[PDB]
């Protein structure tokens, strides 16, 4: 229940234990539109956002040149409809698991969330999700069908601390208090 | 594996670190010179900066990697004057071997150095310089002449002193919850061949080096409220499906329909009103002809890292793909920013767009012209390092006199401090005080002068300052002149170094020598 | 002295390699490349780039000659030695005085300022538009090559080029010489060389029935039987007389395009398509369906046939531009039919350098004595200020006077004269009569450069010496070298 955060830079005098959820990994940072998140819901996404790619053989018969861009429009609409229900639930913080496995994510998901001002983070270990779910108390979302506002958590403010070039996400406050909280501390040192 | 115990490990570690340290000691001070490294791979870089050299140099004994990481930490703290920093901790290992042969415990050697540096903080505060202190006309010019030292650019100090100071005045921004500081590393430095340093240009803002793809496109844009749009969308013939694949006229219509939409995507940029548009990947003459009729200045073959600082400084939203909440592809007018003045100037047989007056994030770029690449290799890293000293100067007004004034002064404070502690740690203070004096002694070695003649006279002047508390001045004096070999106040010579640079230099040098003293043995496992 | 010997001996052997590259008596040296072939030439710009040396410190100076050619564009005839000549007299310094090179930096700066004043003392203005002095001035730089036979004809091509494809924007002659194309045809004589307004191509025609000639050209720069036929109909919609594509030409497209009466070419590089698009006015077409009426040819007078005994080449006759100014981009070429590949490669290096030298002539209309008279003229005052100096810096300062005397000495050893009595007479004559006295290019006499007809611009003397002095400080600022770094 006590996680040690390893960050390069600073001194041990700067080491402080955070009272809330902390994220070691950063966002994609390509768009980087929103500079802060406050009074927004923090969700846990156990799935990944990608165009459908089943493990079996997939043959899409295209009989018209307009169907090509139509498939692109379907991929844009199908992936945005998931974000539409997230925007309807007023959740600006999304946590995605490890993205290097299978589905990963496309390049169009950035412009969809940046327009809706929703922060997203990926490459999170499966064991880290269990640790974050205890302290935050947010019910993980394994699909858009089970996605709702009751499973989503909340926080007062989320500040991203940038020190010596290393950025770290810090969450202040906990909405639903459970019986299994978790704490973490950020270790600051010169070298590993 | 191979494991050796006893003094054999500590002896081979000190001799290995001292051998590679004596190579970089020739660059100490204004009289230092650059050196060349042979990488055997065909690449070579001639510079005096220890951060790159220690990273390139192959470390034989694993204990040598500790000093390599020490230079990497200086970059995150200060990053400038590495010739006068990393060589300080190298002298502590030479005198440590005589203490290991004694009965003094290694931790007692460590504890003696811990109380020495902890008390040395107050010693620096006695000779500490305030924000005003000396004349300090702009207070930057006096420091700018100091940054010219340690490097071979000192002959150009009649120019670079005005170059770095006048450029960084517009970098001031409000960030970190109302904190006034300069966003270091946001300054872009450009290089140009020919003439000399007097041809450099100061840009109070961002300057990108690039030209127009087609010569028929207008190269001049004047006036205010100039909007810029960074488009990273690749315009090319689209590839096929997942491998399911698919009348050649309807097959060719795929390219006809795609390129038709590409022309419509550019028409959406026309309705935006941006004067300058950017494109990452290259295009053919079909999409280039549309940019000519668009009356907008385009650029191709753009680097992604260059456009990331454009959206930050200007404030416009970088668009990698054209999309909105609906299924329509267009460009909204809310993704464009504003700037006070934007104009493209011709410099050194080339042209660059000068973006000035950025409201979102203020910064500055320095466009410098010089002899050639090999001559600007030293001038590149040196100017990038000098940006941190000017930052630390106006962030904290505490500075200290350079040229061996600190090392010669700390010896006197430690002479009375050695008798204060006494017991077994008195010998450790004497060896620590004599080790700090080695750096100014090696300063005259590169100048082919007599250091002991100057140190004996210089320390006598610092002694007369400390021995008399009430002091007009019949005694107090400081400073060391390398050219004339005389003692003169640095207020006239204009050599002053920030205090935060010297404090963090000795703070990091403490744990550097301790890491070697804590190694009892070294074992190496053979690789698979 | 451990690492200093490796830096001195790195550029020491370089001086002997390029020693034969200076003067009208310049000779050649055979070099065996690692590729397995051979390179025999008197031009060091190609040698210094392709040479492989053990010491990487000398490789840093190999790029100094390329930098001088990009920034200035001259010096391959003479100054190419001056880049490595400064380090020759710097050897009796570290092994003798044992002083840090920093003193030399202050000595070279004082010698550089005095050298610029001597050049300005002998500087004289000359008309750049007048072909009187410009005819012998162009032949002065190129007179060191095999072109001496045709130098009368070779000067006509270079003199008419700087007054035609240069123009101006107002700032000087500034323009780009890379877009100007020079066609090199081996065999025959240069008597057929003319100034042509259009592009020539070495690729043959894909179809035997197509007849080669044109009056008013139309240039187009680019199941399966009917599909390509419909594609040819889209190409022939504007009725083009010429079709050029970068890829191959199938046999089916030969018969379909034959009905339109056009010529088809293949294997045309993108470098030629960029020049044809500017000369013929057509726009390079990527998608075939994009061909429109805007691609019609412009200002092409006539089309002819130039064929070697082996295969067929594309030849476009001369034309003009109706006026009834915009010198930033010009479209024109110079056709050159060379006798042999040895002299043909030298003319291309001469013509590009002659336009580069004549560029600097019109950038700085001032003119200075050439042929080796200026180097000896500076050494008179450079050694005079050394005796007036009378200080510690005199030793590195006076040693520079030897470097100025060794520049004409290289021409003496190449010509075969006696440098002893010749250089002793020059130093005595320059300090008394005038600085115009110099060494004859052939007999090696005391005849002045005024009556002999060889001159060099002031910008050529100032920029080349200033760059060589600043570039010589490179190895002087290197105190150590480390081998076996293994990045």
The CATH number of whichever domain residue A54 belongs to comes to: 3.50.7.10
CB contact under 8 A, B193 and C71: yes
Q: Identify which of B34, B193, B284 has the shortest CB distance to residue C67.
A: B193
The residue in chain B having the minimum alpha-carbon distance to the alpha carbon of residue C7 is B36
Quote the tokens at residue A191. 């070298």
Q: Give the Cα separation of B256 and C451 in Å (integer).
A: 71
Give the other-Cβ count within 10 Å of C180's Cβ: 20
Taking the Cβ of residue B447 and every Cβ of chain C, the question of whether any pair is shorter than 8 Å is answered with: yes
B283 in Cβ contact with B235 (< 8 Å) = yes
Torsion of CA B500, B506, B512, B514, to 10 degrees: -130
Domain co-membership, B311 together with B437: no
User: Of C185, C127, C187, C138, which Cα lies nearest the Cα of C351?
Assistant: C138
Q: Identify which of A60, A61, A65 has the shortest CB distance to residue B257.
A: A65
Neighbours of chain B (3+ CB pairs under 8 A): A, C
User: Which residues in chain B have their CB less than 8 angstroms from residue A59's CB?
Assistant: 244
Domain co-membership, B35 together with B159: no
Q: Closest approach of chain B CAs to the CA of A192, in angstroms?
A: 10
Q: Give the Cα separation of A171 and A38 in Å (integer).
A: 9
Domain co-membership, B383 together with B409: no
Give the other-Cβ count within 10 Å of C375's Cβ: 27
User: Which residues in chain C have their CB less than 8 angstroms from residue B447's CB?
Assistant: 100
Q: Which helix (H) or strand (E) holds A2?
A: strand A2-8
User: Of B271, B287, B267, B276, which Cα lies nearest the Cα of B332?
Assistant: B271
User: Of C29, C41, C45, which Cα lies nearest the Cα of C145?
Assistant: C41
Quote the tokens at residue C264. 């088809």
Q: Which helix (H) or strand (E) holds B141?
A: helix B141-147
CB contact under 8 A, A65 and B321: no
What CATH fold (topology level) applies to the domain C198-329? GroEL (3.50.7)
Q: Please state how this structure was obtained.
A: cryo-EM
User: Of C60, C66, C25, C56, which Cα lies nearest the Cα of C408?
Assistant: C25
Number of H helices, E strands in chain C: 17, 14
User: Of C410, C343, C403, which Cα lies nearest the Cα of C379?
Assistant: C403
Taking the Cβ of residue B248 and every Cβ of chain C, the question of whether any pair is shorter than 8 Å is answered with: yes
User: Which residues in chain C have their CB less than 8 angstroms from residue B248's CB?
Assistant: 223, 227
Pick the catalytic residue from C74, C175, C295, C353.
C353
User: Which residues in chain C have their CB less than 8 angstroms from residue B57's CB?
Assistant: 482, 485
User: Is residue B279 flagged as an active site residue?
Assistant: no
Of B342, B361, B380, which closes a domain? B361
B517 in Cβ contact with B92 (< 8 Å) = no
CB contact under 8 A, A61 and B244: yes
Q: Closest approach of chain A CAs to the CA of B234, in angstroms?
A: 12
Residue entry with tokens 């120019």 = B159
Residue entry with tokens 């030897």 = C402
Q: Which of B372, B378, B382, B485 to mutate to test the interface with C (most CBs of C within 10 A)?
A: B372
Q: Closest approach of chain B CAs to the CA of C455, in angstroms?
A: 24
- Start-to-end Cα distance in chain B: 12
User: Which residues in chain B have their CB less than 8 angstroms from residue A80's CB?
Assistant: 325
Going by DSSP bridges, is the β-strand pair A2-8/A183-189 parallel, antiparallel, or unpaired?
Answer: parallel
- Name, in order, each residue with C-beta under 8 angstroms of C202's C-beta and a sequence gap of 6 or more: C313, C314
Domain total in chain B: 3
- Chain B, 347 to 406: residues with Cβ < 8 Å from chain C are 371-375, 378
Query: Where in chain C do CATH 3.50.7.10 domains reside?
Result: 198-329
Residue entry with tokens 């100090």 = B157
Domain co-membership, B340 together with B220: yes
Going by DSSP bridges, is the β-strand pair C39-41/C242-244 parallel, antiparallel, or unpaired?
Answer: unpaired
Pick the catalytic residue from B17, B47, B80, B82.
B82
C169 in Cβ contact with C330 (< 8 Å) = no
Query: What are the helix (H) ranges across B57-105?
Result: 65-77, 90-101
Q: Closest approach of chain A CAs to the CA of B246, in angstroms?
A: 6
**Domain span holding position A120:** 20-180
Q: Closest approach of chain B CAs to the CA of A130, in angstroms?
A: 33
Q: Identify which of B43, B215, B286 has the shortest CB distance to residue C286.
A: B286
Chains A and C touch (3+ CB pairs under 8 A): no
User: Which residues in chain B have their CB less than 8 angstroms from residue C479's CB?
Assistant: 26-27, 32-35
User: Which residues in chain B have their CB less than 8 angstroms from residue C470's CB?
Assistant: 371, 375
Quote the tokens at residue B293. 């009729």
> b/e string for B131-151 if b means 16 or more Cβ within 10 A?
eeebebeebbebbbbbbbbbb
> How many CB pairs below 8 Å do chains A and B form together?
59
CB contact under 8 A, A111 and B319: yes
Pick the catalytic residue from C20, C77, C78, C144.
C77
Q: Which helix (H) or strand (E) holds B387?
A: helix B373-395
The residue in chain A having the minimum alpha-carbon distance to the alpha carbon of residue B315 is A33
Q: Is B125 in a helix, a strand, or coil?
A: helix
User: Which residues in chain C have their CB less than 8 angstroms from residue B371's CB?
Assistant: 67, 467, 470-471
User: Is residue C353 flagged as an active site residue?
Assistant: yes
Q: Which helix (H) or strand (E) holds C305?
A: strand C303-307
Q: Identify which of B33, B248, B256 has the shortest CB distance to residue C479.
A: B33
Q: Is B84 in a helix, a strand, or coil?
A: helix
Pick the catalytic residue from C20, C74, C76, C295.
C76
Q: Give the Cα separation of C24 and B469 in Å (integer).
A: 79
Q: B242 φ, ψ to 5°? A: -60, 0
Domain co-membership, B407 together with B457: yes
User: Is residue C298 flagged as an active site residue?
Assistant: no
Quote the tokens at residue A133. 């779910």
Of B372, B397, B422, which closes a domain? B397
Q: Identify which of C285, C328, C477 has the shortest CB distance to residue B152.
A: C477
Q: Give the Cα separation of C236 and C242 in Å (integer).
A: 10
Angle at C288 between CA C287 and CA C292, to 5 degrees: 105
Q: Specify whether domain C1-126+366-487 bears CATH 1.10.560.10.
A: yes
Quote the tokens at residue B56. 């390139």
What CATH fold (topology level) applies to the domain C127-197+330-365? GROEL; domain 2 (3.30.260)
**DSSP letter string, C238-250:** G--SEEE-SS---
What one-character DSSP code corresponds to residue B118? H
B210 in Cβ contact with B417 (< 8 Å) = no
User: Of B445, B493, B457, B503, which Cα lies nearest the Cα of B117?
Assistant: B503
Quote the tokens at residue C358. 């004549």
Quote the tokens at residue C249. 């030409």
Domain co-membership, B95 together with B2: yes
C408 in Cβ contact with C470 (< 8 Å) = no
Q: Which of B252, B320, B500, B507 to mutate to test the interface with A (most CBs of A within 10 A)?
A: B320
Residue entry with tokens 């409220």 = B225
CB contact under 8 A, A190 and B73: yes
User: Is residue B419 flagged as an active site residue?
Assistant: no
Q: How far is CA B260 from the centre of its chain?
A: 48
Q: B299 φ, ψ to 5°? A: -145, 140
Q: Give the Cα separation of A119 and A114 in Å (integer).
A: 8
Taking the Cβ of residue A56 and every Cβ of chain B, the question of whether any pair is shorter than 8 Å is answered with: no
- Name, in order, each residue with C-beta under 8 angstroms of A175's C-beta and a sequence gap of 6 or more: A137, A153, A154, A155
Domain co-membership, B155 together with B188: yes
Domain co-membership, B447 together with B528: yes
Neighbouring-strand partners of residue B353: B208, B344
The residue in chain A having the minimum alpha-carbon distance to the alpha carbon of residue B249 is A65
The residue in chain B having the minimum alpha-carbon distance to the alpha carbon of residue C231 is B249
**Domain span holding position B350:** 204-361
Give the other-Cβ count within 10 Å of B214's Cβ: 12
User: Of A38, A26, A156, A148, which Cα lies nearest the Cα of A92?
Assistant: A38
Domain co-membership, B45 together with B123: yes
Q: Give the Cα separation of C280 and C297 in Å (integer).
A: 5
Of B375, B397, B419, which closes a domain? B397
Q: Give the Cα separation of B116 and B427 in Å (integer).
A: 12
CB contact under 8 A, B511 and A190: yes
Give, in order, the Cα–Cα distances in Å from B319 to each of A30, B233, B271, B278, B293. 10, 8, 16, 10, 22
Taking the Cβ of residue A58 and every Cβ of chain B, the question of whether any pair is shorter than 8 Å is answered with: yes
Domain co-membership, B393 together with B435: no
């Amino acid at each position: 229940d006590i996680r040690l955060v390893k960050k390069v830079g600073g001194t041990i005098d700067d080491t402080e234990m955070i009272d809330g959820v902390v994220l070691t990994q950063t966002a994609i940072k390509s768009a980087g539109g929103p500079t802060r998140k406050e009074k927004a819901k923090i969700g846990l996404i156990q799935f990944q956002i990608s165009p459908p790619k089943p493990d079996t053989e997939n043959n899409i018969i295209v009989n018209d040149y307009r169907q090509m861009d139509k498939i692109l429009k379907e991929e844009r609409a199908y992936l945005l409809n998931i974000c539409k229900k997230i925007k309807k639930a007023k959740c600006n913080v999304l946590l995605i698991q490890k993205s290097i496995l299978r589905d990963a994510v496309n390049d169009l998901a950035l412009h969809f969330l940046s327009k809706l001002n929703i922060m997203v983070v990926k490459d999170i270990e499966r064991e880290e999700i269990e640790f974050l779910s205890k302290g935050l108390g947010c019910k993980p979302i394994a699909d858009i069908e089970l996605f709702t506002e009751d499973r989503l958590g909340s926080a007062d403010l989320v500040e991203e601390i940038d020190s010596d070039g290393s950025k770290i996400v810090r969450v202040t406050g906990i909405r639903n208090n459970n019986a299994r909280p978790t704490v973490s501390v950020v270790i600051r040192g010169a070298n590993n | 594996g191979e494991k050796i115990s006893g003094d054999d490990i500590r002896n081979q570690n000190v001799l290995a670190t001292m051998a590679v340290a004596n190579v970089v000691k020739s660059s100490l001070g204004p009289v230092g010179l650059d050196k060349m490294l042979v990488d055997d791979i065909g690449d070579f870089t001639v510079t005096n900066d220890g951060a790159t050299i220690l990273s390139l140099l192959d470390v034989q004994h694993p204990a040598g990697k500790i000093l390599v990481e020490l230079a990497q930490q200086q970059d995150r703290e200060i990053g400038d004057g590495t010739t006068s920093v990393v060589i300080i901790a190298s002298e502590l290992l030479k005198r440590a071997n005589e203490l290991v042969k004694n009965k003094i415990h290694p931790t007692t050697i460590i504890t003696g150095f811990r109380v020495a540096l902890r008390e040395a903080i107050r010693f620096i505060n006695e000779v500490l310089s305030t924000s005003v202190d000396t004349l300090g006309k702009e207070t930057l010019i006096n420091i700018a002449k100091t940054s010219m030292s340690s490097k071979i650019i000192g002959a150009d100090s009649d120019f670079f002193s005005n170059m770095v100071v006048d450029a960084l005045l517009a970098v001031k921004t409000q960030n970190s919850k109302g904190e006034i500081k300069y966003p270091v590393k946001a300054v872009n430095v450009l290089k140009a061949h020919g003439k000399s340093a007097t041809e450099s240009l100061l840009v109070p803002g961002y300057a990108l080096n690039c030209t127009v793809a087609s010569q028929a496109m207008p190269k001049r844009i004047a006036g205010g409220n100039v909007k810029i749009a960074c488009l990273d969308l690749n315009l090319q013939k689209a590839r096929m499906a997942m491998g399911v694949q698919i009348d050649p006229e309807q097959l060719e219509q795929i390219r006809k329909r795609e390129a038709g939409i590409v022309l419509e995507r550019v028409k959406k940029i026309i309705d935006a009103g941006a004067q300058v548009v950017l494109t990452t990947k290259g295009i053919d003459d079909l999409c280039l002809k549309e940019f000519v009729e668009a009356k907008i200045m385009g650029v191709r073959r753009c680097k992604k890292e260059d456009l990331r600082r454009i959206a930050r400084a200007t404030g416009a939203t970088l668009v990698s793909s054209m999309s909105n909440l609906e299924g329509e592809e267009t460009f909204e007018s809310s993704y464009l920013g504003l700037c006070d003045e934007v104009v493209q100037a011709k410099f050194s047989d080339d042209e660059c767009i000068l973006i000035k007056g950025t409201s979102k994030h203020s910064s500055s770029s320095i466009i410098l012209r010089g002899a050639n690449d090999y001559s600007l290799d030293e001038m590149e890293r040196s100017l990038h390092d000098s940006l941190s000293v000017v930052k630390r100067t106006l962030e904290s007004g505490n500075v200290v006199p350079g040229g061996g004034c600190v090392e010669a002064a700390l010896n006197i404070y430690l002479d009375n401090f050695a008798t204060t502690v006494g017991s077994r740690e008195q010998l450790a203070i004497a060896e620590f005080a004599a080790a700090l004096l080695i750096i100014p002694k090696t300063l005259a070695v590169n100048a082919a002068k007599d250091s002991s003649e100057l140190v004996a006279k210089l320390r006598s002047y610092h002694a007369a300052s400390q021995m008399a508390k009430p002091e007009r001045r019949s005694y107090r004096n400081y400073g060391l002149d390398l050219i004339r070999g005389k003692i003169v106040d640095e207020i006239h010579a204009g050599v002053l170094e920030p205090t935060i640079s010297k404090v963090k230099s000795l703070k990091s040098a403490l744990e550097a020598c301790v890491a070697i003293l804590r190694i009892d043995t070294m074992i190496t496992v053979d690789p698979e | 002295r451990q690492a200093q010997i490796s830096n001195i001996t790195a550029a020491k052997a370089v001086a002997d390699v390029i020693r034969t590259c200076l003067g009208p008596k310049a000779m050649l040296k055979m070099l065996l490349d690692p590729m397995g072939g051979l390179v025999l030439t008197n031009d060091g710009h190609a040698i210094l780039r392709e040479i492989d040396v053990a010491h990487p410190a000398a490789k840093s100076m190999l790029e100094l000659s390329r930098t001088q050619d990009e920034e200035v564009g001259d010096g391959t005839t003479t100054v190419i030695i001056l880049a490595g000549e400064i380090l020759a007299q710097c050897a009796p310094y570290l092994i003798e005085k044992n002083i840090h090179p920093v003193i030399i930096i202050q000595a070279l700066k004082k010698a550089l300022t005095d050298a610029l004043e001597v050049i300005k003392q002998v500087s004289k203005p000359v008309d750049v538009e007048n072909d009187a002095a410009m005819k012998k001035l162009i032949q002065a730089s190129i007179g060191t090559k095999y072109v001496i036979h045709w130098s009368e004809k070779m000067c006509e091509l270079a003199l008419d080029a700087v007054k035609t494809v240069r123009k101006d924007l107002p700032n000087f002659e500034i323009d780009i010489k890379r877009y100007v194309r020079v066609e090199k045809i081996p065999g025959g004589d240069v008597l057929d060389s003319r100034v042509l307004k259009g592009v020539l191509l070495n690729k043959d025609v894909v179809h035997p029935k197509m007849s080669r000639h044109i009056e008013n050209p139309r240039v187009v720069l680019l199941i399966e039987e009917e599909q390509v036929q419909l594609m040819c109909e889209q190409i022939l919609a504007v009725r083009p007389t010429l079709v050029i594509t970068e890829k191959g030409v199938s046999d089916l497209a030969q018969h379909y395009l034959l009905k339109g009466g056009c010529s088809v070419l293949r294997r045309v590089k993108k470098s030629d398509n960029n020049r044809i698009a500017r000369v013929t006015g057509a726009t390079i077409v990527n998608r075939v369906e994009d061909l429109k009426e805007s691609d019609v040819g412009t200002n092409c007078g006539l089309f002819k046939v130039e064929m070697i005994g082996d295969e067929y080449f594309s030849f476009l006759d001369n034309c003009k531009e109706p006026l009834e100014g915009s010198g930033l981009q010009k479209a024109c070429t110079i056709m050159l039919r060379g006798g042999s590949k040895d002299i043909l490669n030298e003319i291309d290096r001469n013509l590009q350098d002659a336009m580069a030298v004549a560029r600097n002539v019109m950038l700085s209309p001032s003119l200075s004595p050439g042929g080796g008279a200026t180097e000896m003229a500076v050494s008179v005052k450079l050694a005079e200020k050394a005796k007036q100096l009378e200080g510690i810096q005199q030793w590195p300062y006076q040693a520079v006077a030897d470097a100025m005397e060794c520049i004409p000495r290289t021409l003496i050893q190449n010509a075969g004269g006696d440098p002893i009595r010749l250089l002793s007479q020059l130093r005595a004559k320059h300090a008394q009569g005038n600085f115009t006295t110099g060494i004859d290019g052939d007999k090696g006499k005391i005849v002045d450069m005024v009556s002999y007809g060889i001159w060099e611009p002031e910008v050529i003397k100032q920029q080349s010496v200033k760059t060589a002095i600043e570039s010589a400080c490179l190895l002087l600022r290197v105190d150590d070298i480390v081998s076996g770094v293994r990045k």
